[PDB]
Amino acid sequence: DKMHIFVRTATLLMIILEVEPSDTIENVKAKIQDKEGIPPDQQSLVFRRKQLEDGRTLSDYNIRTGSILELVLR
Amino acid sequence: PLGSMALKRIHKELNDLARDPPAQSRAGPVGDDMFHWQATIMGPNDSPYQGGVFFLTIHFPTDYPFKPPKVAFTTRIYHPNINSNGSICLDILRSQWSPALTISKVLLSISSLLSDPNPDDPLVPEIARIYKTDREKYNRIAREWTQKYAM
C-alpha cells in the first residue's frame, strides 16, 4: 500500500511518481529529474493554483494519493 | 495509502488512450484528482443521438480494476437505460464487470447502448414502453433532446 501523485505538463504524458507524505518538493523535483531529465532548479510545481515551495512537504500542502500537480519551467 | 494498484492502472489506461486515441470518444482527468475523469462521446450514426456531444463523469474506486468505475452522463439524454440523474443501467458496470475491462471498452459499450437500448432492463420504464410500442415517437424525442442538450 503506497502513495502515488501525478505531474501534468503541456508537452509530456502524465508522469506518475511514488512518494510519501514526508517527501519534500525537492525530493519530488529529484524524482521528476530521474524520469524526465529536467533539473530541479528549473521546475515550478503547482497544486490547486498554489505555488509549491521546495522546503515544504506534501502533507504540508495536503497532497493526498492520486493528486495531480502541474509542472512548468522556471 | 490505499489505491496503489488502482492508480497505476488508471495512469496506464490514460497513457494508452493518448498513444492510441479512440475514434469516437475522449477521456481523462480535467481536475487535480486522478480518480475523477471526464469523458466525451459522439452519439452514434444511425441512431437518434447522431451528432450530439455527450459529457460523462468517471469515478474510479480505490480497488479498481477489481470493482467497476462509476460512470454517469452529465448531458441530459432521452434513453430507456439512462435516468434524469445521468445514471446508466449497463451490465458491465454492475455484475458483468471484469478487471480485464478498461475505460476504453466501457466507452464502446456505452456507445453500443445508445445505438441499441435494452428496453427489457430499463431505468425509466415509461421511456422503455415508448421504445417498445412507438419507436418513431421515441426517435423524435431522442433527436429533439440531442439538439436541445447535446448540441
Curated annotation (Swiss-Prot), chain B:
Q: Which residues form the active site?
A: 89 (glycyl thioester intermediate)
Q: Relate the outcome reported for changing residue 97 to A.
A: Abolishes histone H3 ubiquitination and decreases interaction with PHF7
What reaction gets catalysed by this protein?
A: S-ubiquitinyl-[E1 ubiquitin-activating enzyme]-L-cysteine + [E2 ubiquitin-conjugating enzyme]-L-cysteine = [E1 ubiquitin-activating enzyme]-L-cysteine + S-ubiquitinyl-[E2 ubiquitin-conjugating enzyme]-L-cysteine; S-ubiquitinyl-[E1 ubiquitin-activating enzyme]-L-cysteine + [acceptor protein]-L-lysine = [E1 ubiquitin-activating enzyme]-L-cysteine + N(6)-monoubiquitinyl-[acceptor protein]-L-lysine
Annotated Gene Ontology cellular component terms: cytosol; extracellular exosome; nucleoplasm; nucleus; protein-containing complex
Name under which the protein is recorded: Ubiquitin-conjugating enzyme E2 D2
Query: What species does this protein belong to?
Result: Homo sapiens
> What happens on changing residue 89 to A?
Catalytically inactive. Loss of ability to promote FBXW2-mediated GCM1 ubiquitination. Inhibition of TNF-alpha-induced degradation of NFKBIA
What's the EC number here?
2.3.2.23, 2.3.2.24
Q: Does the keyword Transferase apply?
A: yes
Gene this protein is translated from = UBE2D2
Q: What does this protein do?
A: Accepts ubiquitin from the E1 complex and catalyzes its covalent attachment to other proteins. Catalyzes 'Lys-48'-linked polyubiquitination. Mediates the selective degradation of short-lived and abnormal proteins. Functions in the E6/E6-AP-induced ubiquitination of p53/TP53. Mediates ubiquitination of PEX5 and SQSTM1 and autoubiquitination of STUB1 and TRAF6.
* Keyword vocabulary terms for this entry: ATP-binding, Nucleotide-binding, Transferase, Ubl conjugation pathway
Q: Which GO terms describe its biological process?
A: protein autoubiquitination; protein K48-linked ubiquitination; protein modification process; protein polyubiquitination; protein ubiquitination; ubiquitin-dependent protein catabolic process
Q: Which residues form the UBC core domain?
A: 5-151
Family that this chain belongs to: Belongs to the ubiquitin-conjugating enzyme family.
A GO molecular function term, named singly, is: ubiquitin-protein transferase activity
Bridged cysteine pairs (disulfide): none
* UniProt entry tagged with the keyword Transferase: yes
Q: What is the effect of changing residue 68 to A?
A: Abolishes histone H3 ubiquitination and decreases interaction with PHF7
Task: Kindly give the SUPFAM superfamilies that the UniProt entry links to this protein.
Answer: UBC-like
Q: In which pathway does it act?
A: Protein modification; protein ubiquitination
Quaternary structure, per UniProt, is: Interacts with SCF (SKP1-CUL1-F-box protein) E3 ubiquitin ligase complex. Interacts with CNOT4 (via RING domain). Interacts with E3 ubiquitin-protein ligases CBLC, PJA1 and PJA2. Interacts with PDZRN3. Interacts with PPP1R11. Interacts with E3 ubiquitin-protein ligase PHF7; the interaction inhibits cleavage of PHF7 and promotes association of the complex with the nucleosome core particle.
| InterPro entries, alphabetized | UBQ-conjugat_E2_core, UBQ-conjugating_AS, UBQ-conjugating_enzyme/RWD
Give, from the UniProt record, the effect of changing residue 67 to A/E: Strongly reduced interaction with CNTO4
